[PDB]
C-alpha cells in the first residue's frame, strides 16, 4: 500500500459524493413540489367534506 | 508535516461532501415521510367523499 493510493481514493470518493449531491438536490425539489400539491389538494378535500356536514 | 497536511485536507474535502450527502438524504427521507402522511390523509378524504357523493 501507498499514501498516494490513499490520496487518490479520497479524491475519487469526493467526486462520487459530489455527483450524489446533485442527484439528491434534484430529488428533493421534485418531492417538495409533490408535497405542496398534496397539501393544497388536502385543504380542498377537507373543506368539501366540511361543507357536506353543514 | 506536509504529508499529514495533504492527507487532512483531502480527508476534509471527502468528509464535507459525504456529510452533504447525509444531510440531503435525511432531508429527502423527511420529505418522503411528509408525502406519505399527506397521501394517507388525501386517500382518506377522497374515499370518504366518493361515498357521500
Swiss-Prot record, chain A:
Q: Which gene encodes it?
A: CEP135
Q: Where is the signal peptide?
A: none
Q: What positions belong to coiled-coil segments?
A: 3-54
Residues at the site labelled Microtubule binding: 22, 25, 29
Q: Look up and give the organism this protein is from.
A: Homo sapiens
- Outcome reported for the amino acid change (mutating residue 22 to A): Reduced microtubule binding ability but normal coiled-coil homodimerization
Relative to the complete UniProt sequence, the shown stretch is 82 to 133 of 1140
Similarity field: Belongs to the CEP135/TSGA10 family.
Free-text domain note? Coiled-coil domains are critical for microtubule binding via the formation of a two-stranded coiled-coil structure in homodimers.
Q: Name its cellular compartments.
A: Cytoplasm, Cytoskeleton, Microtubule organizing center, Centrosome, Centriole
Q: What does this protein do?
A: Centrosomal microtubule-binding protein involved in centriole biogenesis. Acts as a scaffolding protein during early centriole biogenesis. Required for the targeting of centriole satellite proteins to centrosomes such as of PCM1, SSX2IP and CEP290 and recruitment of WRAP73 to centrioles. Also required for centriole-centriole cohesion during interphase by acting as a platform protein for CEP250 at the centriole. Required for the recruitment of CEP295 to the proximal end of new-born centrioles at the centriolar microtubule wall during early S phase in a PLK4-dependent manner.
Query: Subunit comment for this entry?
Result: Homodimer. Interacts with DCTN2. Interacts with CEP250.
Question: What disease association does UniProt give?
Answer: Microcephaly 8, primary, autosomal recessive: A disease defined as a head circumference more than 3 standard deviations below the age-related mean. Brain weight is markedly reduced and the cerebral cortex is disproportionately small. Despite this marked reduction in size, the gyral pattern is relatively well preserved, with no major abnormality in cortical architecture. Affected individuals have severe intellectual disability. Primary microcephaly is further defined by the absence of other syndromic features or significant neurological deficits due to degenerative brain disorder.
- Its recorded name reads Centrosomal protein of 135 kDa
From Swiss-Prot, chain B:
**Superkingdom of this protein's organism:** Eukaryota
Q: Give residue numbers for the site Microtubule binding.
A: 22, 25, 29
Q: Where, subcellularly, is it found? A: Cytoplasm, Cytoskeleton, Microtubule organizing center, Centrosome, Centriole
Give the residues annotated as coiled coil.
Answer: 3-53
- Record's disease association: Microcephaly 8, primary, autosomal recessive: A disease defined as a head circumference more than 3 standard deviations below the age-related mean. Brain weight is markedly reduced and the cerebral cortex is disproportionately small. Despite this marked reduction in size, the gyral pattern is relatively well preserved, with no major abnormality in cortical architecture. Affected individuals have severe intellectual disability. Primary microcephaly is further defined by the absence of other syndromic features or significant neurological deficits due to degenerative brain disorder.
Q: Quaternary state and partners of this protein?
A: Homodimer. Interacts with DCTN2. Interacts with CEP250.
The record describes the protein's role as: Centrosomal microtubule-binding protein involved in centriole biogenesis. Acts as a scaffolding protein during early centriole biogenesis. Required for the targeting of centriole satellite proteins to centrosomes such as of PCM1, SSX2IP and CEP290 and recruitment of WRAP73 to centrioles. Also required for centriole-centriole cohesion during interphase by acting as a platform protein for CEP250 at the centriole. Required for the recruitment of CEP295 to the proximal end of new-born centrioles at the centriolar microtubule wall during early S phase in a PLK4-dependent manner.
Q: What is known of its domains?
A: Coiled-coil domains are critical for microtubule binding via the formation of a two-stranded coiled-coil structure in homodimers.
This chain belongs to the protein called: Centrosomal protein of 135 kDa
Q: Which organism is it from?
A: Homo sapiens
User: Gene name?
Assistant: CEP135
Amino acid at each position: 500500500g501507498s499514501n498516494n493510493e490513499l490520496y487518490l481514493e479520497l479524491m475519487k470518493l469526493r467526486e462520487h459524493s459530489d455527483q450524489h449531491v446533485k442527484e439528491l438536490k434534484t430529488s428533493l425539489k421534485k418531492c417538495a413540489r409533490e408535497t405542496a400539491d398534496l397539501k393544497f389538494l388536502n385543504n380542498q378535500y377537507a373543506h368539501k367534506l366540511k361543507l357536506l356536514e353543514k
